[PDB]
RNA sequence: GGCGACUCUCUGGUCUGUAACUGACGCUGAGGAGCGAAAGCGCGCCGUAAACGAUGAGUGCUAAGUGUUAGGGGGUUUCCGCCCCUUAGUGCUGCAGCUAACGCAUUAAGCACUCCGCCUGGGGAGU
RNA sequence: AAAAAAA
């Protein structure tokens, strides 16, 4: 049971993972386009991004999260939708970060 | 490059119908327009004696039922083999109307052509026979592969 | 899966079902389980694979059958193909091909069907039927063909001509412009038939370009004989009987502040600073409802017109020029029958006291916005000496306007500042100059007063709970806003709101942050593309852009019919005291039709004003050929690039003129991406361009990439 | 497009003035180019040292 | 050749202005010494090098136009701003002249003087 | 392609 946390979205060209953690980086929950049953083209899409983002977000709200810091990696098209999806799930987003090298 | 103009046929002198003339020219063999002018005027007297209606009332009704609305056209882009439903241009409707009317009239069992042409018109007018069927046939086929176009 | 897939299909098959997103589905159907949420998705995969539910591009789900008959408005292209705008605009553009449009015209309502193929990114529509005919009439040049006639439509959006028979020639020769009352329409291969209505005049005439647009849009025109009779009978001076029951305000310092070319002076203004630090604001509005009485000839015409329209070269007024510029006008130094709103406003901008009453004022002076700025901002002594009695009032006006603005921004109002422009033409209609319409302090002063007046009137009648007309602005479209909120996340911003329920303040908080940055024009432009339009309505639904729940238009009855209605409702409810049930039921019946009509007439007017602006904008630049300009990339469509010159003139730059490389539109990051040379053309970038093709007739201007 | 530092008679930019420097970074933290802030090259260089000195002592953030 | 996070320490050169001083103390520089890539190879040697803006150094002279970097002088103007002049650097365009042509053109490949390096058909052979 | 508001 924790309130504040980070959401590490990895949107690649092939897949969207979404982990959510605490401030110490311990995984609270996660979901992904592949674990959403999307396959091939669909895993790349921003539809599958929001699906995974919300699937893990709603998993985090069970543990009782409210505020998320986001961190993004990878060049995929999913970050845009996924981050809105964290706001649309209910969780308020503060600091955005794009940690893409 | 620019659609060639179709040859302007004269009206049929007794029914004043360029449709009826076009039938004559469709029926004409080896440039014997005389034989075909006789046959039709013999066939339309047969229609008027049986029905009592004007031959023009029946013949136009016959064409309505033979005349196609949609046709199958072969399209083979890459694979495709698509039987593209194509709307029959109003000139090609009459074309296929008169072609089928004559083509199936010649194939009928009756002894003389004047009777054969009369009976095919009478059958066409009653929404039956073979020439009406042929329109249905291609529409049934056009409905079958209607998912292309 | 099978169970839910059927249960979902059964729910979607209900007649009341509308398109629902993944989240919205499991709300009416109701799902709360984490493992049932894991069950939903592979089910959506299956139903969409089997062709049982189709995904609308807005990520809403509906059976192929539900969408099948989209019944959108025809968005036809000038070349001869088309796209579509479905009933719910959430659905994307469905492609209607030249071959299968089947007698559909740009703007008609249809029932296009889907194709089981697509040779591109777009869904393939097909006009299997026309649910409704639109384009009732077209304007155009008449042309003689093969011993026949054929009016060619003004716009190229109709790709065919209109068959003119000789009985509908009626003047139209090779040259003459004419409207066509289409007496028949296309038929497979055949064209539309018609007649000749108004012989506008030879097509190549100066002032036909306007007159052609005057009839194209279906704008108003010349006052009917009964309206002109009533206008002629209206007194040029106030009768002593009309001064009865009106508060005398003539001996007070009351003035008008308008543009230099304004003859239709609606509003008067006085401000007195009180000893407690509050201000007393006297807003006085021309009493048009006195002259233009209910069910009069001018009233029926004013309803028909709906608003004044301000074309580049002329004004088409809502009420006759004799009234609008004469007795109704608050001309300087005369008695004026005016409905007033007198407001005491505290240091936080809150209206503590207010009174609405009938009155008569003596316009001490007619001021310009330019003069008032020079007094207040430039501190100009010469204009101060000239208007010495007004100078103390202008200082109190400046402070109150600041207080009202500070309230309005703190309430959360969204203040964009897209540079509007005023095309300057002579009396012959030649475009001598074009310049930016600078809203400085004096304009922003009058704006705030009219706003608080309008809010106060609207608030009063909300609490009176009587039938009344409001000026509403809905919350922005949740799909367009969703794309905007994504777009502003490219830059690292976070907006404290959802696409369903965003607070106006949140959208202002972006506009403030981006001020003076490379993400300023881009964001602002995508925020507009997510904004809607404002309209009149009998229900108090609130004004999103002004962030207030109570708004109406009271302060311009010469030029807006809803303001003349408010004036009559004020006279009905407050002055005459008629708040009986029969009076309410009568107005409750009449207001919805007036509101919907007047809102349609406003949109028609604005479209026409813009059309003439864009027209004379080309006319101005029919000599700019070659001349290079440093103008910013205002828009990046896939078919080219759009560059606004500083003076608000935009022009096109296709890949045809992107000669160096084969560029590509990145939608997510609103930009042009070239690859062969490795180039980048984002929006808002300051660049150079050259005028190549100002085609005035279609209102085109073209540029070429001189550079960045 | 004017140099803020010349315009306002400023000769020395100070890595301690956090809100002064804040006008010359993006929200992520990226130093905004001369072409967009209109700074003079002389000052752009003074500015950039200051921003980096700021970043070291956690007055400003690092990029994205 | 090169040299890009920040700070401190130590340290080299250049530019502008004033002329207080010295009073030709200057230029070039075989040889020599030192610096000096992936080399090549055990921090050491090696040290050849599209180590080719394909252009030696120094000096003076010979149209212009325009941009940028670091200074100076002046002008109005409150500084700013905007204009004018100027020094040093770095670009683009362009005369005269030069060039086989291409081009170069006050950052010369022009017009001159001093000193150095270097070339004298292609292979064979950088053997 | 084009928001308030004003003209």
* DSSP structure class, residue D25: B
Mutate to test the interface with D, among C489, C492, C646, C685 (most CBs of D within 10 A): C492
Rounded to 5°, the CA angle A57-A63-A65 comes to: 60
Resolution of the coordinates, Å: 3.1
Distance from the Cα of residue C675 to its chain's centroid: 39
Closest CA to C194 of C168, C176, C223, C229: C168
Measure the CA–CA gap between B88 and C43, rounded to whole angstroms.
Answer: 44
CA distances from C601 to C297, C347, C559, C595, C607 (A): 19, 39, 12, 10, 10
Tokens of C493: 């911003």
Inter-residue contact C376 to C443 (CB < 8 Å): no
Which residues of D lie closer than 8 Å to A, measured between beta carbons? 28, 64
Of the candidates C389, C360, C364, which has an alpha carbon nearest to the alpha carbon of residue C375?
C389
- Phi and psi at residue C635, in whole multiples of 5°? -150, 150
Name the neighbours of C, counting chains with at least 3 Cβ pairs within 8 A: A, B, D
DSSP assignment of C47-92 equals HHHTTSSEEETTTEEE-HHHHHS---EEEE-SSS-EEEE-SSTTS-
The whole-angstrom separation of Cα B39 and Cα B44 is 9
Contact C449, C269 (CB under 8 A): yes
Enumerate helices (H) and strands (E) in chain B, giving the number of each: 6, 2
Tokens of D3: 């140099």
**Structure token pair of residue C210:** 């306007």
* Positions of E strands within B1-149: 70-75, 82-87
Q: How far is CA C689 from the centre of its chain?
A: 29
CB distance C552 to C469 below 8 Å: yes
Instruction: Say if residues B29 and B36 touch (Cβ distance below 8 Å).
Output: yes
Residue ranges of E strands in C363-436: 366-368, 421-425, 431-436
Burial class (CB in 10 A: 0-12, 13-18, 19+), C253: middle
Nearest CA in chain C to B149: C115
Provide the CA C88 to C1' E41 distance, Å, integer: 77
DSSP 3-state of C107? coil
How many Å from the CA of D43 to C1' of E60? Answer: 39
CB atoms within 10 A of CB C205: 14
Measure C476 CA to E107 C1' (Å): 61
In terms of CA atoms, which chain B residue is nearest residue C100? B149
Rounded to whole angstroms, the Cα distance separating C25 from C61 reads 9
Residues 278-317 of C with CB under 7 A from strand F: 310
Experimental method: cryo-EM
Determine, for residues A99 and D28 on separate chains, whether the beta-carbon distance falls below 8 Å: no
Residues 479-518 of C with CB under 8 A from D: 491-493, 513, 516-518
Alpha-carbon distance C32 to C38, whole Å? 11
Discontinuities in chain A (C→N > 2.5 Å), after residue: none
Covered bases, chain E (protein CB within 7 Å): 5-7, 68-71, 79-81
Cβ(C253)–Cβ(C365) under 8 Å? no
User: Cβ of C251: how many Cβ atoms within 10 Å?
Assistant: 9
Cβ separation A80–C668 shorter than 8 A: yes
Spatial distance between the Cα atoms of A51 and C38, rounded to a whole number of angstroms: 10
Query: Which nucleotide's C1' atom has the smallest distance to the CA of C635?
Result: F1
Beta strands A16-21 and A27-32 are antiparallel
Q: Are C82 and C101 in contact (CB under 8 A)?
A: yes
């Amino acid at each position: 049971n924790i309130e504040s946390g980070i959401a590490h979205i990895r949107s690649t060209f092939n897949n969207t993972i979404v982990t959510i953690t605490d401030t110490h980086g311990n995984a609270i929950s996660w979901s992904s386009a592949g674990a959403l049953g999307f396959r091939g083209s669909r895993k790349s899409t921003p539809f599958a991004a929001q699906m995974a983002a919300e699937t893990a977000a709603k998993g985090s709200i069970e543990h009782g999260l409210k505020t998320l810091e986001v961190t993004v990696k990878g060049p995929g098209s999913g970050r845009e939708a996924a981050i809105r999806a964290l706001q649309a799930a209910g969780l308020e987003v503060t600091a955005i970060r794009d940690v893409t090298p | 490059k620019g659609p060639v103009a179709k040859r302007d046929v004269l009206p049929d002198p007794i029914y004043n119908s360029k449709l009826v003339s076009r039938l004559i020219n469709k029926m004409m063999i080896d440039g014997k327009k005389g034989k075909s002018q006789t046959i039709l005027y013999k066939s339309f007297d047969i229609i008027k004696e049986r029905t009592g209606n004007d031959a023009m009332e029946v013949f136009e009704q016959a064409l309505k039922n033979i005349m196609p609305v949609l046709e199958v056209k072969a399209r083979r882009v890459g694979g495709a083999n698509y039987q593209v439903p194509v709307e029959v241009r109003p000139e090609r409707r009459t074309t296929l109307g008169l072609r089928w009317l004559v083509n199936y009239a010649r194939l009928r069992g009756e002894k003389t052509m004047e009777e054969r042409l009369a009976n095919e018109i009478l059958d066409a007018a009653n929404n039956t026979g073979a020439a009406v069927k042929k329109r249905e046939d291609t529409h049934k086929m056009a409905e079958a592969n209607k998912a292309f176009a | 899966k099978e169970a839910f897939m059927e249960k979902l299909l059964s729910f979607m098959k209900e007649e009341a079902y509308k398109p629902l997103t993944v989240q919205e589905l499991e709300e009416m159907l109701n799902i709360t389980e984490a493992e049932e949420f894991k069950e939903l998705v592979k089910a959506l995969v299956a139903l969409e694979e089997k062709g049982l539910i189709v995904r609308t591009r807005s990520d809403r789900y509906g059976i192929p059958e539900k969408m099948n008959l989209i019944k959108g408005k025809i968005s036809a292209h000038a070349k001869g193909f088309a796209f579509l705008l479905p009933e719910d605009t959430s659905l994307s553009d469905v492609f209607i091909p030249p071959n299968e449009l089947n007698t559909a015209m740009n703007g008609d309502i249809v029932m296009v069907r889907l194709n089981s193929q697509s040779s591109g990114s777009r869904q393939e529509g097909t006009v299997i039927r026309i649910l409704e005919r639109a384009i009732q009439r077209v304007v155009g040049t008449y042309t003689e063909t093969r011993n026949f006639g054929f009016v060619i439509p003004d716009d190229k959006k109709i790709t065919s001509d209109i068959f003119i028979p000789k009985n509908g020639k009626n003047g139209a020769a090779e040259g003459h412009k004419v409207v066509v009352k289409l007496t028949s329409y296309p038929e497979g291969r055949m064209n539309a038939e018609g007649e000749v209505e108004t012989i506008l005049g030879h097509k190549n005439d100066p002032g036909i370009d306007i007159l052609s647009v005057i009839h194209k849009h279906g704008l108003p025109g010349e006052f009917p004989a009964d309206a002109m009779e009533q206008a002629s009978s209206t007194p040029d001076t106030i009768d002593e009987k009309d001064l009865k029951d009106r508060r005398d305000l003539r001996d007070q310092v009351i003035v008008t502040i308008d543009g230099a070319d304004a003859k239709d002076l609606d509003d008067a203004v006085t401000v007195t600073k009180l000893d407690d630090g509050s201000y007393k604001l006297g807003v006085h509005i021309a009493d048009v409802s006195h002259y233009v009485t209910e069910n009069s000839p001018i009233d029926k015409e004013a309803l028909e017109r709906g608003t004044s329209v301000y074309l580049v070269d002329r004004v088409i007024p809502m009420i006759p020029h004799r009234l609008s510029n004469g007795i109704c006008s608050l001309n300087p130094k005369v008695d004026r029958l005016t409905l007033s709103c007198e407001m005491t406003i505290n240091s936080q901008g809150q209206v503590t006291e207010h009174e609405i009453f009938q009155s008569v004022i003596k316009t001490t002076e007619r001021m310009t916005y330019s003069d008032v700025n020079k007094i207040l901002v430039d501190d100009d002594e010469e204009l101060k000496q000239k208007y010495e009695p007004l100078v103390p009032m202008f200082k109190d006006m400046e402070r109150l306007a600041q207080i009202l603005r500070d309230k309005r921004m703190d309430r959360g109002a969204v203040d964009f500042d897209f540079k509007e422009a005023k095309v300057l033409v002579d009396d012959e209609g030649a475009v001598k100059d074009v310049v930016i319409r600078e809203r400085s302090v004096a304009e922003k002063l009058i704006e705030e007063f009219m706003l608080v007046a309008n809010e106060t009137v609207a608030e009063h009648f909300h609490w009176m709970n009587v039938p009344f007309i409001y000026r509403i602005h809905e919350e922005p479209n949740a799909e367009k806003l969703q794309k905007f909120l994504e777009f502003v996340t490219t830059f690292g911003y976070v907006v404290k709101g959802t696409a369903g329920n965003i607070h106006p303040r949140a959208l202002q908080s972006i506009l403030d942050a981006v001020r003076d940055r490379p993400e300023e024009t881009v964001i602002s432009t995508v925020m507009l593309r997510s904004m809607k339009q404002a309209k009149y309505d009998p229900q108090s639904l609130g004004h999103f852009g002004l962030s207030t729940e109570f708004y109406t238009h009271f302060t311009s009855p010469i030029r807006r019919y809803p303001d003349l209605i408010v004036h009559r409702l004020i006279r009905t409810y407050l002055i005459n005291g008629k708040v009986d049930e029969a009076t309410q039921e009568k107005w409750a019946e009449r207001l919805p039709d007036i509101a919907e009509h007047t809102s349609s007439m406003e949109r028609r007017a604005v479209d026409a004003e813009r059309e003439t602006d864009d027209l004379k904008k080309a006319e101005y630049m029919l000599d700019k050929i070659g001349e290079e300009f440093d103008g910013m990339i205002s828009s990046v469509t896939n078919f080219g690039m759009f560059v606004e010159l500083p003076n608000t003139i935009e022009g096109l730059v296709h890949v045809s003129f992107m000669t160096d490389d084969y560029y590509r539109f990145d939608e997510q990051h609103f930009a042009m991406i070239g690859e062969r040379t490795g180039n980048v053309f984002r929006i808002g970038d300051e660049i150079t361009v050259k005028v190549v093709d100002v085609n005035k007739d279609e209102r085109n201007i073209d540029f070429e990439i001189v550079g960045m | 497009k004017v140099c803020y530092f010349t315009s306002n008679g400023i000769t020395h930019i100070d890595y301690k003035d956090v809100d002064l420097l804040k006008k010359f970074v993006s929200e992520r933290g990226k130093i905004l180019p001369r072409r967009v802030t209109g700074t003079n090259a002389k000052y752009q260089r003074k500015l950039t040292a200051a921003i980096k000195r700021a970043r070291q002592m956690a007055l400003l953030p690092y990029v994205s």
